[PDB]
RNA sequence: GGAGGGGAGUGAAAGAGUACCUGAAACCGUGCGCUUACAAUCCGUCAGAGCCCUCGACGUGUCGUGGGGUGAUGGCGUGCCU
């Protein structure tokens, strides 16, 4: 009898959200900006 | 959902500075100062790790050579002598040896000499 | 009497009733094992020859396997930002010499 | 162990270390010669420190019961109390803080044989 | 001039250890009776009653 | 003198006293154990004598698959971030 918990998503269908900036273990300091420059503080235009 | 960053950042500054007791001024007291001491203190532990093999080989063969000396023999020709006689012993049992046992040092000598070949500057 | 007995890479001076850590070796607690001998101090004569040396060897119980000091290993680079968090716990025996 | 009795006088308008300067000339000694060298010492914060001390004599003298001749003075400290903040204008219409400190005087009188 | 660094713990209390107050030797005296102490300075006033003693 | 406190009480609790739930860190004390006045110390790390404490076994103190605190002395060692 399938109850409310036994309902789980389909495998590799949900994916952790990743979350920079959060100190250098995943993406600290830069969030994958590189040094300064236009792009690393807000954006280039594609025209 | 609002949430306090209390228990997450107190957890892991109770473990720094619990791992930094005995240290002096500041680095026992503040959190970033115990946690550059903790870089610093590991880093050193990690080096002195290895190092610390070569430090006890450099003090096994110091006191092997004070003690061939005193049998009338240099290192370098009791090392050749016992590596020809093939006993395998190593520089920290040699060590013990000489320093617990001075007769078998003796007898481990004289093998080294009885190995040894007649002229050891020969081009043999 | 007492011998120089090789295990795990490794030489102990040992005798007769001595515990001694060792590398681990896959025996359960309570068994025996024979390992080999580099040198054997019997009072005065030592022999060092490598065949006496064969034809002897060290039998040894094993009392328990246990495990090393915990090393904890941050390795670090300054003005890099770059730090290695890591542990280790070296696995042991204890064996304890019967006889020579 | 000893029979003792304390007393305490929590809020003392003297700042710390100025009570401590003349606390360090008593620790050990009896209550009679603590109370002279505090009679005849050159210092203000000496008067609430000997008023502790006579508190707490007359304690262990009268609830306890002991002989006020054996009272020697074991345990004497003096600890921070309530800081209160004031400013005093300077030159050049800077304001500076002036911390107004008390303390708190702990004394702990024990009787000890002859 | 300004101090260009923070005074460690050890320095700050080995020099603040300086700072203390020196214990004045009492003799005694009679006075009407009852011994009591007085300074060797005040022994004549307190011998003429010239000091008030609690 | 008061402030404050010690007994005595109320309270389940006064380590709830109208400065009052819980009471951390910085900072300031008191007591005890080790160490320090011939010494050039990013203040730690690796060896490490001595002293004190503690867990077992056997005697009267001496070792052990021990654990702790402080550490004379030697080797190594140019804080963190941008």
Redesign the pocket.
């Known amino acids: 009898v399938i109850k409310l918990h036994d309902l789980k998503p389909a495998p590799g269908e949900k994916k952790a959200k990743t979350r920079v900036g959060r100190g250098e273990g995943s993406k600290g300091?830069t969030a994958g900006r590189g040094?300064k420059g236009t792009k690393a503080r807000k954006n280039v235009p594609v025209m | 959902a609002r949430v306090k960053r209390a228990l997450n950042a107190?957890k892991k500054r109770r473990t720094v500075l619990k791992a930094s007791?005995?240290?002096?001024?500041?680095?026992?007291?503040?959190?970033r100062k115990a946690k550059?001491?903790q870089?610093?203190?590991?880093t050193?532990?990690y080096?002195?790790?290895r190092?610390?093999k070569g430090?006890?080989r450099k003090?096994w063969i110091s006191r092997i050579n004070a003690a061939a000396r005193a049998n009338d023999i240099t290192y370098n020709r009791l090392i050749q002598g016992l590596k020809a006689a093939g006993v395998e012993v190593d520089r920290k049992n040699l060590a013990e040896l000489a320093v617990s046992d001075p007769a078998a040092f003796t007898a481990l000598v004289d093998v080294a000499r009885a190995a040894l070949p007649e002229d050891v500057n020969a081009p043999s | 009497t007492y011998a120089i007995v090789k295990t795990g890479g490794k030489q102990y001076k040992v005798a007769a009733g001595?515990?001694v850590?060792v590398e681990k070796l896959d025996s359960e607690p309570g068994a025996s094992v024979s390992l080999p001998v580099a040198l054997v101090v019997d009072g005065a004569n030592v022999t060092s020859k490598a065949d006496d040396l064969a034809k002897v060897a060290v039998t040894a119980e094993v009392?328990?396997h246990?495990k090393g000091?915990k090393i904890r290993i941050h390795k670090?680079?300054?003005?890099?930002?770059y730090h290695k968090r890591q542990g280790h716990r070296q696995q042991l025996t204890?064996l304890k010499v019967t006889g020579i | 162990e000893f029979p003792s009795?304390?007393?305490?006088?929590?809020?003392?308008?003297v700042s710390?270390?100025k009570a401590?300067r003349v606390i360090?000339l008593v620790?050990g000694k009896s209550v009679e010669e603590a109370l002279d060298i505090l009679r005849w010492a050159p210092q203000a914060a000496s008067?609430?420190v000997a008023?502790?001390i006579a508190?707490?004599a007359?304690?262990a003298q009268?609830?306890?019961g002991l002989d006020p001749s054996t009272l020697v003075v074991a345990?004497?400290?003096?600890?921070?109390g309530?800081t209160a903040k004031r400013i005093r204008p300077r030159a050049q219409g800077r304001a500076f803080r002036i911390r107004k400190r008390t303390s708190?005087i702990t004394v702990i009188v024990e009787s000890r044989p002859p | 001039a300004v101090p260009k660094r923070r005074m460690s713990?050890a320095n700050?209390?080995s020099r603040?250890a300086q700072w203390k107050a020196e214990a004045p030797g009492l003799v005694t005296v009679s006075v009407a009776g009852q011994q009591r102490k007085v300074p060797r300075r005040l022994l004549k006033a307190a011998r003429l009653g010239l000091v008030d003693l609690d």
């Open positions: 300091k040094t | 107190q007791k005995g240290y002096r001024g500041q680095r026992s007291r503040l959190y550059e001491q870089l610093h203190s590991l050193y532990a080096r002195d790790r190092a610390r430090e006890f003090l | 001595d515990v850590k009392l328990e246990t000091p670090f680079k300054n003005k890099t930002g204890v | 009795a304390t007393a305490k006088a929590r809020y003392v308008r710390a270390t401590r360090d620790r008067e609430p008023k502790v508190s707490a007359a304690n009268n609830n306890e345990t004497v400290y003096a600890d921070e309530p708190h | 713990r700050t209390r603040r």
